[PDB]
Amino acid sequence: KHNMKAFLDELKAENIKKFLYNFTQIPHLAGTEQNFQLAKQIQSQWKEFGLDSVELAHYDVLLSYPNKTHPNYISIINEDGNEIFNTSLFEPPPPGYENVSDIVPPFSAFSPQGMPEGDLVYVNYARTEDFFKLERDMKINCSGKIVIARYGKVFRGNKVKNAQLAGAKGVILYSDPADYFAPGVKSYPDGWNLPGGGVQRGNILNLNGAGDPLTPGYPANEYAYRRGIAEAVGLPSIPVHPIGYYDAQKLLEKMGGSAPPDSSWRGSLKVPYNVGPGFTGNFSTQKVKMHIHSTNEVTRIYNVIGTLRGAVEPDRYVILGGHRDSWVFGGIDPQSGAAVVHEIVRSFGTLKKEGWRPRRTILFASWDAEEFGLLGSTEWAEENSRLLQERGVAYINADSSIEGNYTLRVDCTPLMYSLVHNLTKELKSPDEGFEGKSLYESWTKKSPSPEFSGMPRISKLGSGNDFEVFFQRLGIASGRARYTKNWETNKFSGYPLYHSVYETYELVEKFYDPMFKYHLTVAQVRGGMVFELANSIVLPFDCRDYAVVLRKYADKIYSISMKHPQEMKTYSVSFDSLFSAVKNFTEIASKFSERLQDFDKSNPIVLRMMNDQLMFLERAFIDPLGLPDRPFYRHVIYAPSSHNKYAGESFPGIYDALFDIESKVDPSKAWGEVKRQIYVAAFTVQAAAETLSEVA
Amino acid sequence: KHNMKAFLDELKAENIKKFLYNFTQIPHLAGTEQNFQLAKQIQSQWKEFGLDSVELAHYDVLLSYPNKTHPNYISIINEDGNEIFNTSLFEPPPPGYENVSDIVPPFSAFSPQGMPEGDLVYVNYARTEDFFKLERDMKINCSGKIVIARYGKVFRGNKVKNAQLAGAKGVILYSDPADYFAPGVKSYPDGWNLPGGGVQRGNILNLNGAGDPLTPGYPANEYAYRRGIAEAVGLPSIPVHPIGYYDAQKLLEKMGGSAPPDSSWRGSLKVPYNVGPGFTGNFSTQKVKMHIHSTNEVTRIYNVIGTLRGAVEPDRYVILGGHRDSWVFGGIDPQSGAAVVHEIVRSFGTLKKEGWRPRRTILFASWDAEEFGLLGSTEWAEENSRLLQERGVAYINADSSIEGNYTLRVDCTPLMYSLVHNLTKELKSPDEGFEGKSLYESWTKKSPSPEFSGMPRISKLGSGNDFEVFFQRLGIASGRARYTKNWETNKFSGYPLYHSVYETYELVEKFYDPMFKYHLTVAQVRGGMVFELANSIVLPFDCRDYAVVLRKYADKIYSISMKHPQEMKTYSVSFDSLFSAVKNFTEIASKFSERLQDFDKSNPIVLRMMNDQLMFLERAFIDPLGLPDRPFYRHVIYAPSSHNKYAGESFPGIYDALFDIESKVDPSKAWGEVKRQIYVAAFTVQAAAETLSEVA
Numbered sequence A, B: 001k002h003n004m005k006a007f008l009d010e011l012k013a014e015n016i017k018k019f020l021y022n023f024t025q026i027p028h029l030a031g032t033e034q035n036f037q038l039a040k041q042i043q044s045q046w047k048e049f050g051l052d053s054v055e056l057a058h059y060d061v062l063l064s065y066p067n068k069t070h071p072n073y074i075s076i077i078n079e080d081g082n083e084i085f086n087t088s089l090f091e092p093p094p095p096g097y098e099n100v101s102d103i104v105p106p107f108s109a110f111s112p113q114g115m116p117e118g119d120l121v122y123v124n125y126a127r128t129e130d131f132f133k134l135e136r137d138m139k140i141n142c143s144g145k146i147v148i149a150r151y152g153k154v155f156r157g158n159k160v161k162n163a164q165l166a167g168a169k170g171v172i173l174y175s176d177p178a179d180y181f182a183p184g185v186k187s188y189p190d191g192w193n194l195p196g197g198g199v200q201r202g203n204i205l206n207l208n209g210a211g212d213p214l215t216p217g218y219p220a221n222e223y224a225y226r227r228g229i230a231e232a233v234g235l236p237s238i239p240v241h242p243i244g245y246y247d248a249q250k251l252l253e254k255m256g257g258s259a260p261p262d263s264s265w266r267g268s269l270k271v272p273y274n275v276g277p278g279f280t281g282n283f284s285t286q287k288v289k290m291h292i293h294s295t296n297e298v299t300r301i302y303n304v305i306g307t308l309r310g311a312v313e314p315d316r317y318v319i320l321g322g323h324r325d326s327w328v329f330g331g332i333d334p335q336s337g338a339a340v341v342h343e344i345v346r347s348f349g350t351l352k353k354e355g356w357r358p359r360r361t362i363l364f365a366s367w368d369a370e371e372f373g374l375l376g377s378t379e380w381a382e383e384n385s386r387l388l389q390e391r392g393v394a395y396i397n398a399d400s401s402i403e404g405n406y407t408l409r410v411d412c413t414p415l416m417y418s419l420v421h422n423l424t425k426e427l428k429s430p431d432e433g434f435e436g437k438s439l440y441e442s443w444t445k446k447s448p449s450p451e452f453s454g455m456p457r458i459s460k461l462g463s464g465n466d467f468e469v470f471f472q473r474l475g476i477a478s479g480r481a482r483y484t485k486n487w488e489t490n491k492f493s494g495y496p497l498y499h500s501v502y503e504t505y506e507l508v509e510k511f512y513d514p515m516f517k518y519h520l521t522v523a524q525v526r527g528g529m530v531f532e533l534a535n536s537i538v539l540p541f542d543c544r545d546y547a548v549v550l551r552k553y554a555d556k557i558y559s560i561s562m563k564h565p566q567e568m569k570t571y572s573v574s575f576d577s578l579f580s581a582v583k584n585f586t587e588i589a590s591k592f593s594e595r596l597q598d599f600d601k602s603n604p605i606v607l608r609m610m611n612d613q614l615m616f617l618e619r620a621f622i623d624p625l626g627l628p629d630r631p632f633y634r635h636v637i638y639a640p641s642s643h644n645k646y647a648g649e650s651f652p653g654i655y656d657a658l659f660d661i662e663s664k665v666d667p668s669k670a671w672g673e674v675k676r677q678i679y680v681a682a683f684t685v686q687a688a689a690e691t692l693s694e695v696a
């Protein structure tokens, strides 16, 4: 038969291995010829594999690149203005790639140009609370200083925004061995750790979901009217540059001024981690000078869009999307994901050649320019927003398939919790010691739920990947899954070789997944979810799981507010409306669930009515007015944290109104806005419940 | 059989007459006990008539009322400060109603309080072009003056906004016999003309679609957080008051300063129509003093919502809505409409008692607080916006059924043109001289299309009624129909007794429609449209009619721009993208039409796919970012004119960018914004076309 088991059995580890090798021999930087050539290869092959149509969708968006003939670097300069120390111009290339052309040197994408000179201040991870410590407790003023910050904890764009608002005139980012060097394992090429010359690339924008900085709201097509650079969304106003720990040691070792305030400010280098400002006595007349000459350029990008038309509901879309563009070779990020997508397409295509079709339409996407701000997915969605919002069932992301080899990681909407539990119970664990056991058993054992005994951890969606426009802007049910590490040792960072030249095919084949078994398990999870979403007669969403988390989030936000009991009395701040809405959602969802299991389906109009009620339930959490000063974050339950784009925040409107409230000048106005956000949230929860009531 | 003919034949003129009489014996002002009692009567009767459920939906919104013990009035005062002339405190009540309690005296709803004193300037109709003439050509400065303006041409709220922006410190509105006294007909009670003591009530807000001034975006429910008065939407900043032509004569007769600039500034009173400022020589030390003491008050309002559940598609809504609140007796506005709705409900209910049900759900609405800013419809829609946007097929409005007795008037979306043509061909004309002929024949003869020989005039929707939230905010296909006058004699105004105490049952029965035949014809048009929309297997919308008007609108906006050929060359202003999008819409709509007529319907999924494509086509013209500084006007093809809320404007974004462009300080910036609006329009038209392409 043509069922889920036929789909799943056709997936092969050895195919995934061949595709990864094929996608990782040369760099595929967005906007380059190399990456256009790969786009055309993927298009031709998805056609060979059996899809009904495969098209390129192109856009002209703002990208950023270093100047080839005028390199970026940082100096220590003496009182005469002699440059006595210079940071490196390139990462030493890995064995056998030392002749590869067009490796982009490390840089911070979208940095403005400049040569600022000044005294250094060390700001730990440049988090909101690091700046609070420095400015409020230690009384150190960053205004007109160059700040040096270690990578980790939070998205680098948030670090830059925080430094800018503190008055810094430049930012230097570095990788500390405390965060990117796991104890007892060797540096690349002999193990999976970051060497002292390794550097993490990455953009430093604050887009808040806008997409292309020049065309917020509308696709960057051939006739688009653009903003001028001065009005572009999300660009930083001070120069930024990333370095490795060999270079960082030479900038940190002379630091004077105040001592670090406690041991959470000390990394693992042989230096005091003094905060500054400036260098100790003998070197106190030396300065740090940045030299940044990168340029922003409007450049063409290419998405590949494949269609497998549905047999019964061709106007209902289940999307499997992930990016293709890489910083250099992309051995983990993104090609470990893209190779998985390619094998999934191949398997659906083999079923299609034997006469099978899914019930609903499946769209497959190879996105461009993800590394420069989620640009290709967001422009495409801006173009197709009306089709997506009335027809979009679900979005499954497909970036890196591995970031470790310990256990599964899932982040998703509560609407897919029961789908994920059911599927993982039918899959085999790849783990050593669990042969013959289910993936559910191994995952639950290694990553237990903090709430419920005998269940696994499933996280909220944050951002920093291509699901953002689908989930937080448009309200399409979304999820993602990969293999991950045990979060001991380097607990505040991704894998050590992230966005470095050392992320290669050999990294993966030698040190992460030599049998390609973790890749195969991830293909079965991502693929299996898509199969169910596109083929189950009733959509596989359980509204009751949203009711349970809504109560948890309401308890959490109430507890935050209750740190201020005297203000809640004075300004009559009540959460009663929100708890009432959550109770109502719980009751209405339960009755909906009963009708769903019973009506059953001799009647296709009743079925589609309840499938439409299921599809539009995520959609009901969208406020067309957006969140304050963030118009493209429209989901009222979930937004990316204002302090860290990678992390999700629940009831973000209320959370941000409460944050640091004890420091606001006008408390009556601040508490007024807390109350306004309570009203908005309660109304939206009740309105979402009401979509599940009987329709007439 | 239970078909359209059974529905239509059950409607009776004599029932409509009895209901009008019943609804017009006492005043039904929003927020009063009288109007709550009528709401409860309508609820009980719609239940008796056979609807499945009938509920009240209440809101607490900002309303405005005069102070009972401190009356509003205007004076001429002398140099000593003696009040030598005072305007009247009330309209003389009509015969037999001189003992009715609670007739609200004439006032301008939402006026601030004040007693400003000053010199008068006469500003004709207070249109944008009247102020341009006064300030640019005649060099007269309205700053710190009281302005007096005649009613007509444009919505009164626009007059107030224009006066305020010119620096006026108060506004006096009056009814000129030139606009409200038809030659050769007598004053009420002996004919249908406005007497010298008659006054037009009405609100003076500039809401731009917001609804309740205190809760933009969200329903004004029990836990809503409100804006303070200072941040309320749309309130005027200077006092305003309306008067009749007896009083107006006494304010205008002493005017000096400059002469009227031409005869289009002269009405029909025996006065020079001098512009001022101030009075002639001997009276030049006299002034005009306003006394306004009205208060804004948060007050409860009640909508009645009736449901007739659909047999096949209960999750698809066809809405018939009109208001119940009146200024005084409401003999035309709104009860001539509400009596029509009541008989329509009764007729659908009789079919339902014999076992029939419509295919789709029909919702019936009796809206409150329409006269204070479309408040009841807009709050209800804000509450139910998620259900309306995914399930709303169409909205048919039902305010005043008559404004004359000459011929039919229809304003609607192009999607209902072919529906209206087909229906009116099957209805009998009520007109003298057309007995035995169709309503299509009489209407086409009396109101020919300016474009097409052998077809009737159908106008764009403007605003100033309860369809605004459904059409311009939410993108639900909308229409309205009534009997109207021949637009000779008083061509710039509604009927003479509009919003006066003299609009009574007797006005209608004696002078407009003694046989109730025009009412019956309007019930058949409104009712017939609802019947078809709720019962036709394929929705009765023709996408090809949108293609035809889109070309007309594109030609029109191009022609406006081409008044500035040198600027179009210098700034490279091209309409090519918009014409391309319109061509594409024409081609795609034509192919869609062919698939629609053929697929035919053994296949209900294919049917619903194309019914969904039809329903979501109006919805595709919505931009979730809104129009500039008007976030609740989201439709890109149609908005209410920025200069006149009653009139519709096509491609409003482009139109407003071009308006008065030759006066802007920075032409490169102004023409940049023209180009931005061209891009937005072209994109939206192409995106709307693409919803009609094959779905996969």
Ligand SMILES: *[C@@H]1O[C@H](CO)[C@@H](O[C@@H]2O[C@H](CO)[C@@H](O[C@@H]3O[C@H](CO[C@H]4O[C@H](CO)[C@@H](O)[C@H](O)[C@@H]4O)[C@@H](O)[C@H](O[C@H]4O[C@H](CO)[C@@H](O)[C@H](O)[C@@H]4O)[C@@H]3O)[C@H](O)[C@H]2NC(C)=O)[C@H](O)[C@H]1NC(C)=O
Binding pocket: A577, A578, A580, A581, A584, A682, A683, A686, B055, B056, B057, B058, B222, B223
């Ligand atoms: C969770 O779900 C429940 C439904 O089970 C909702 O309950 C409603 O709650 C509101 C309060 O937010 C109640 O509002 C009150 O309505 C009264 C009138 O209700 C009757 O009549 C209406 C017609 O207008 C019917 O629809 C309804 O069924 C009732 O028969 C008003 O009289 C109340 O106002 C008076 O008291 C208040 C409170 O002190 C004063 O402020 C006022 O000034 C006034 O004196 C009030 O407006 C409503 O009746 C409830 N519906 C029910 C029980 O069916 C919850 O609201 C919902 N949670 C959320 C967040 O939506």
Ligand SMILES: *[C@@H]1O[C@H](CO)[C@@H](O[C@@H]2O[C@H](CO)[C@@H](O[C@@H]3O[C@H](CO[C@H]4O[C@H](CO)[C@@H](O)[C@H](O)[C@@H]4O)[C@@H](O)[C@H](O[C@H]4O[C@H](CO)[C@@H](O)[C@H](O)[C@@H]4O)[C@@H]3O)[C@H](O)[C@H]2NC(C)=O)[C@H](O)[C@H]1NC(C)=O
Binding pocket: A055, A056, A057, A058, A222, A223, B577, B578, B580, B581, B584, B682, B683, B686
């Ligand atoms: C009305 O409907 C028609 C479709 O019938 C649309 O036509 C498209 O118009 C755009 C222009 O807006 C064309 O865009 C051009 O695409 C070229 C590549 O197209 C080929 O390859 C793509 C894959 O990316 C395929 O999808 C496509 O079928 C083609 O095979 C580009 O090379 C062009 O860019 C080059 O020339 C331009 C113009 O001088 C330069 O500015 C560039 O720098 C570059 O050198 C260009 O982008 C598109 O191909 C047309 N599609 C067709 C014919 O199918 C209209 O756009 C539509 N109207 C609106 C308003 O949407």
Ligand SMILES: *[C@@H]1O[C@H](CO)[C@@H](O[C@@H]2O[C@H](CO)[C@@H](O[C@@H]3O[C@H](CO)[C@@H](O)[C@H](O[C@H]4O[C@H](CO)[C@@H](O)[C@H](O)[C@@H]4O)[C@@H]3O)[C@H](O)[C@H]2NC(C)=O)[C@H](O)[C@H]1NC(C)=O
Binding pocket: A418, A419, A422, A540, A541, A542, A597, A598, A599, A600
């Ligand atoms: C994840 O897996 C779980 C466990 O299998 C699954 O929950 C189960 O779903 C089934 C199917 O809905 C439930 O079965 C129903 O049981 C009730 C009462 O006991 C009956 O009323 C139902 O009978 C109707 O429907 C049947 C077909 O589905 C008809 O054969 C019958 O004639 C009736 O019309 C039905 O048998 C079962 O109770 C739950 N089990 C639970 C909750 O423990 C869950 O749905 C899966 N999640 C997904 C797919 O997202």
Ligand SMILES: *[C@@H]1O[C@H](CO)[C@@H](O[C@@H]2O[C@H](CO)[C@@H](O[C@@H]3O[C@H](CO)[C@@H](O)[C@H](O[C@H]4O[C@H](CO)[C@@H](O)[C@H](O)[C@@H]4O)[C@@H]3O)[C@H](O)[C@H]2NC(C)=O)[C@H](O)[C@H]1NC(C)=O
Binding pocket: B418, B419, B422, B540, B541, B542, B597, B598, B599, B600
């Ligand atoms: C307003 O009234 C007009 C005039 O009646 C109406 O337009 C007409 O609609 C009918 C029904 O779609 C059209 O009839 C079709 O003609 C074409 C080609 O000549 C045929 O392909 C069609 O045959 C198919 O569908 C039939 C059932 O509808 C089946 O019996 C048949 O087996 C085929 O499947 C069909 O007969 C007619 O051509 C137009 N006339 C015009 C445009 O002049 C219009 O639709 C009405 N507007 C509304 C309802 O909004």
Ligand SMILES: O=C(O)CC[C@H](NC(=O)N[C@@H](CCCC(=O)Nc1ccc(F)cc1)C(=O)O)C(=O)O
Binding pocket: A152, A153, A154, A155, A202, A203, A333, A370, A371, A372, A373, A374, A399, A400, A463, A464, A465, A491, A492, A493, A494, A495, A498, A645, A646
């Ligand atoms: O522009 C954007 O929104 C994101 C573009 C890009 N996106 C990613 O690289 N996303 C990776 C991030 C992987 C690295 C990681 O997870 N970092 C991390 C882990 C724990 C922390 F506490 C802090 C950082 C992913 O989603 O797989 C980037 O972050 O520069």
Ligand SMILES: O=C(O)CC[C@H](NC(=O)N[C@@H](CCCC(=O)Nc1ccc(F)cc1)C(=O)O)C(=O)O
Binding pocket: B152, B153, B154, B155, B202, B203, B333, B370, B371, B372, B373, B374, B399, B400, B463, B464, B465, B491, B492, B493, B494, B495, B498, B645, B646
């Ligand atoms: O607040 C609002 O948006 C409108 C509230 C109310 N609405 C109406 O009274 N609407 C009537 C207006 C009827 C009078 C009219 O049509 N006036 C008109 C006609 C021609 C002109 F050139 C100018 C005005 C209707 O739609 O039937 C009002 O206008 O005060």
Ligand SMILES: *[C@@H]1O[C@H](CO)[C@@H](O[C@@H]2O[C@H](CO)[C@@H](O)[C@H](O)[C@H]2NC(C)=O)[C@H](O)[C@H]1NC(C)=O
Binding pocket: A022, A025, A040, A041, A044, A045
């Ligand atoms: C990755 O695999 C593809 C597909 O086999 C290779 O592209 C093909 O190259 C052959 C030999 O030159 C050509 O004849 C085909 O026309 C290509 N097919 C395409 C583009 O669809 C590609 O060379 C491989 N890349 C690497 C780095 O090994």
Ligand SMILES: *[C@@H]1O[C@H](CO)[C@@H](O[C@@H]2O[C@H](CO)[C@@H](O)[C@H](O)[C@H]2NC(C)=O)[C@H](O)[C@H]1NC(C)=O
Binding pocket: A081, A082, A083, A084, A085, A086
């Ligand atoms: C750091 O790099 C700079 C720039 O290349 C070096 O300074 C230059 O040295 C050359 C040759 O002595 C001079 O002609 C240039 O005028 C210098 N340029 C600037 C901007 O100072 C410097 O030697 C390097 N420092 C170290 C320690 O290698």
Ligand SMILES: *[C@@H]1O[C@H](CO)[C@@H](O[C@@H]2O[C@H](CO)[C@@H](O)[C@H](O)[C@H]2NC(C)=O)[C@H](O)[C@H]1NC(C)=O
Binding pocket: B022, B025, B040, B041, B044, B045
């Ligand atoms: C308008 O008609 C209604 C309905 O007949 C009248 O309301 C009824 O009044 C009678 C006699 O007092 C009561 O017994 C009924 O209970 C009422 N029914 C309702 C409210 O549904 C109403 O009196 C009439 N109004 C006027 C002004 O004639």
Ligand SMILES: *[C@@H]1O[C@H](CO)[C@@H](O[C@@H]2O[C@H](CO)[C@@H](O)[C@H](O)[C@H]2NC(C)=O)[C@H](O)[C@H]1NC(C)=O
Binding pocket: B081, B082, B083, B084, B085, B086
């Ligand atoms: C216009 O109305 C005003 C207010 O009622 C009249 O002026 C008042 O007259 C009484 C009795 O003479 C005085 O005691 C008050 O002090 C006056 N009030 C004000 C505010 O001036 C006035 O007589 C009326 N004018 C005409 C022509 O009837």
Ligand SMILES: *[C@@H]1O[C@H](CO)[C@@H](O)[C@H](O)[C@H]1NC(C)=O
Binding pocket: A067, A068, A069, A070, A295
């Ligand atoms: C890159 O730098 C060189 C000079 O070192 C300069 O000639 C060129 O303009 C720069 N390229 C840009 C800005 O693209």
Ligand SMILES: *[C@@H]1O[C@H](CO)[C@@H](O)[C@H](O)[C@H]1NC(C)=O
Binding pocket: A141, A143, A144
């Ligand atoms: C920080 O330093 C700048 C520049 O000298 C100054 O203008 C600013 O007010 C300072 N802030 C303090 C001391 O809080």
Ligand SMILES: *[C@@H]1O[C@H](CO)[C@@H](O)[C@H](O)[C@H]1NC(C)=O
Binding pocket: A192, A404, A405, A485, A511, A512
């Ligand atoms: C792969 O798994 C083994 C077994 O625990 C572990 O020791 C090794 O470090 C893992 N590789 C990576 C990259 O985590």
Ligand SMILES: *[C@@H]1O[C@H](CO)[C@@H](O)[C@H](O)[C@H]1NC(C)=O
Binding pocket: B067, B068, B069, B070, B295
């Ligand atoms: C109405 O006017 C009287 C005085 O003439 C005053 O006592 C009362 O406060 C006013 N009512 C209001 C503001 O509602």
Ligand SMILES: *[C@@H]1O[C@H](CO)[C@@H](O)[C@H](O)[C@H]1NC(C)=O
Binding pocket: B141, B143, B144
């Ligand atoms: C109109 O008069 C006011 C007040 O006297 C003045 O401030 C304003 O500038 C004047 N505008 C002109 C003369 O254009």
Ligand SMILES: *[C@@H]1O[C@H](CO)[C@@H](O)[C@H](O)[C@H]1NC(C)=O
Binding pocket: B192, B404, B405, B485, B511, B512
């Ligand atoms: C009703 O119709 C007649 C016939 O033309 C007309 O003369 C009369 O004035 C009409 N009534 C109104 C209110 O227009």
